Amino acid sequence: GRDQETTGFAWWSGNARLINLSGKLLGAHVAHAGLIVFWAGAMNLFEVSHFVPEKPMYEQGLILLPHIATLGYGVGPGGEIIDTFPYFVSGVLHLISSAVLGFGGVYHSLIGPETLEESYPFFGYVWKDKNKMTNILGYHLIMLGLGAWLLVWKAMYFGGVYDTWAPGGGDVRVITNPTTNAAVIFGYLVKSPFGGDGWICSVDNMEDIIGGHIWIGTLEILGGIWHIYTTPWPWARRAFVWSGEAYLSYSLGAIGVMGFIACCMSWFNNTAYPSEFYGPTGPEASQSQAFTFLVRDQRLGANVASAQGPTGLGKYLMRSPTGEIIFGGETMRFWDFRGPWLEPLRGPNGLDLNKLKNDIQPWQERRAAEYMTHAPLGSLNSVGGVATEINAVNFVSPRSWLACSHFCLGFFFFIGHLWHAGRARAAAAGFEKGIDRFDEPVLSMRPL
Amino acid sequence: ENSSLWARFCEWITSTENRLYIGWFGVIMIPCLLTATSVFIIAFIAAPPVDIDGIREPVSGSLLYGNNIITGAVIPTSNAIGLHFYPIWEAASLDEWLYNGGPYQLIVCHFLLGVYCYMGREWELSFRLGMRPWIAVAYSAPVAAASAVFLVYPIGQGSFSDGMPLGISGTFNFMIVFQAEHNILMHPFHMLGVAGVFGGSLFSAMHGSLVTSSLIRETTENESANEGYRFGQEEETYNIVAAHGYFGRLIFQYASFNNSRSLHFFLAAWPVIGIWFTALGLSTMAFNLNGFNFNQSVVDSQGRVLNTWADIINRANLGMEVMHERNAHNFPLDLA
Amino acid sequence: GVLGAALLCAIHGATVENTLFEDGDGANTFRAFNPTQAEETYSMVTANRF
């Protein structure tokens, strides 16, 4: 440890003492890297320990198992469970491996050399050394580029992943033909984020999700080598701030935006987050209501096309503002929905009247009856209805836990951006301590 | 001189000698706010009535259509549009734009982009004067709050009709419909924000009283007490030890700040942290994580249910659940 | 009155805190305040021009 009178940093801003201490700081990230793996192993074994494999997975309050189950471990057709031993392995694998990271986090933080500059020259770095930073950048682009390939190799050689758009209920599919067309891949990035377009949440097939990772696997290896052999150009010297805290706040601006995207992708995308495992989306559970309550007129035989509502709009089926046959009611706002239990009921002109009255599979209504009940709107003590719903059931969707947590986690990092990116800009200039009281600028300016 | 056309231009934007500073956030703040201001005035005065719910019953919002200041509003975008980007050119005629909820989505997109950048130039001028930069952090507490009621809440609901209208009576409907669906008063983030402003007003009434009550005698009694301070002076205008000495007697000595730099941090940190939770409150309530729900919770033996106050607040919410959007719901759940 | 006083608690607490006078050398700027000092702790001129 240290003290305040040698560094000017109190007990609460204490981790800022080890900015210029390379070796302690290395132990600080390794120890924290242990806790991420340690949370991954402990929470996985905890959720396996309370897992009833006959009820659906999203009903039991689970968030880490559908991540493993999307990859296709112990799952069968329609979202069923075969065996829960691979869910036990990864919780065991992370938990033992965290102690290996745990020992290195204790070691370098206490006994290992506090500045690994002159002893270990490959590892020693000064924050203004630009060539060394672009090296340490460029090494990790490989380690983060190779990790993209593991998903590609597991989807093309090692059994494949859960493709929820497979016919007759989704199951595990080896994606043989990845869509690698650059015009198809980069069409998502420069697409608008508003409704009907949906910037990157609207990737609808498994053919692209692993198809995209071939790009980001290749680029981060091509880009990783680029920063090893090059230094930043003189416009990048005229643009950025080259301190230690400045590199942090650049990152905090990035992973603030990362949180808002995972906030939205777990709320809208039922392709990377399949509805059999994470539960239905908000738009899926609302569109499940009007479909199941259109089956509840076919048993009585009234005309769903001629069913006029109270406002003269159509009780069951009406027309989109771009002219398509959609559902009606207050669920008209969700007409941009697509789902594998409903897409075999759509023709050119939206969904077909002749097809809906005749060509309903029995399993499609069976899935669209669970999705009426398990709508994601709940409460905070896990009641699970509308706010005017009494203490009867105990359910709130993992989509609602992931969208709320990763909004707030991905929000304060933007406040984390505005803290450090202002402070690093100030302290590089000189006046982070305050006004000089002798030669200050405002006394040397004109009025008004 | 030998300076370029561009360098002449950059030594004018970043010039601090201007009456209002522009900066590089202000070159895209100023044309967005003047866009959003000048269209807000027109739709507050001359907008034709907007179908808000898609059921083709247009709601009036203009002063020229028999409204006053309180009932005037800029009506949100229709339910049939939802989250589709609906600019002025996608509409065939201009009146088709106005009837469908046009100028709501034009204002909010230019407003929110404007106030993200008004936060920007609060940093930028503070770098141009040698100030420490964290006023831009403190302006993020309303910016977090205004981003939620206009943008983060229509995402989780799926439509810009459920966002907040730009009207005084328009706001009051949005407060009622929200608590009917989400029970905001029984959510601890709204409890923090309520303490954020009741604490925030107390910490301004109390701090501002003691500085007035310790002013040094420099004027007469006919002249106002504000004439003792002359602008830009160096010596302190009020006794600080006397105010800590007063407030130390008042409750106890440990319950005060003697360090005035630690005092003014506490005045900044208390409401700003408090508004951050009530900004994240309805951000999490946008994704349907409502609040507490203690309905039918206190029960005795023989299976009977005793009322609490939480069952009384149920009856208020249940009386407003079955009244908002009165001609919309064809089905016995309010999923949208 | 309530929302207006909450705004004056947040600005004055932040305007003072960001126009402080450099009087110490540690970056913990709460340490540099002898409360019996005759001079003020922030710059009312600079805070005006901001």
């Binding site: 009025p447 008004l448 | 002063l63 028999g66 002076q233 | -």
Partner: peptide, 30 residues
Amino acid sequence: MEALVYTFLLVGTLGIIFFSIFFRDPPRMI
């Protein structure tokens, strides 16, 4: 009738806000 009385009092408030910025009493140091 009152629809033009309201708009007088709105742009009347915006009048002072113009005059309170650019034609303010200029603060003089010391």
